[PDB]
Structure formats: structure tokens, C-alpha cells
């Protein structure tokens, strides 16, 4: 190999350092949203029992 | 050939000994700068995971 190859290797690791991977904060927010579901269903259940 | 040719041969060797070529220390420095990119991206990743 020659100089151009080594410079391309450096450029490629520079590229990978700035890769645009998926926004996983969306996935973690979706995980966090489960509190609302569980607690609202608990509201529903408690309201039904109180009415009964 | 004659004396002038042989002296020109010696002179051409002298010229090649003092040739001005590209400054490759800059290429070495550009190679060394890739650590900063890698480690800063590691900072970014670790901060994101800690926040999550």
C-alpha cells in the first residue's frame, strides 16, 4: 500500500466517528411511556371497584 | 562523454540531496488527530446513555 491508502483509512475512521445512527432517545422515551399505561389502567380498575 | 557531463552528474546528485518535498509531518499529525475524534464520540455516547 501507499500514502493515499493510509490517508483514506484515516478518513474512513473519521467518517465512522461522525456516522448518523438512529435516534435511540425515541426508543428510550417509548420505554418510559409505559408508566402512563400501567397507572391509567390502575385508575380504571380502582374506579370500577369503587363503583361496584 | 566529457568532464562537463560528469560534473553535471555530480551536481544532479547534489540537487536531489536537497530536493524540497511535501511536508509529511502534517500527514503524521492528521493521523494522530483521529484519537480526538474517537474519544470525543465515546464521550458523546456515554453522556447519552447516562442521561437515558
Swiss-Prot record, chains A, B:
The modification N-methylphenylalanine is found at residue 1. Changing residue 37 to E: Pilus-minus S phenotype. It is found in: Fimbrium; Membrane. GO terms for cellular component: membrane; pilus. Disruption phenotype: Deletion mutants show loss of observable pili. Keywords: Fimbrium, Membrane, Methylation, Transmembrane, Transmembrane helix. Induction: By the two-component system PilR/PilS component PilR. In the contrary, PilS is a negative regulator of pilA expression. In addition, an increased level of c-di-GMP correlates with reduced transcription of the pilA gene. Expression of pilA seems to be negatively regulated by the accumulation of pilin at a cell end. Belongs to the N-Me-Phe pilin family. This is Type IV major pilin protein PilA. It comes from Myxococcus xanthus (strain DK1622). The lineage of its organism: Bacteria, Pseudomonadati, Myxococcota, Myxococcia, Myxococcales. The gene is pilA. The chain holds residues 13 to 64 of 220 of the full protein.
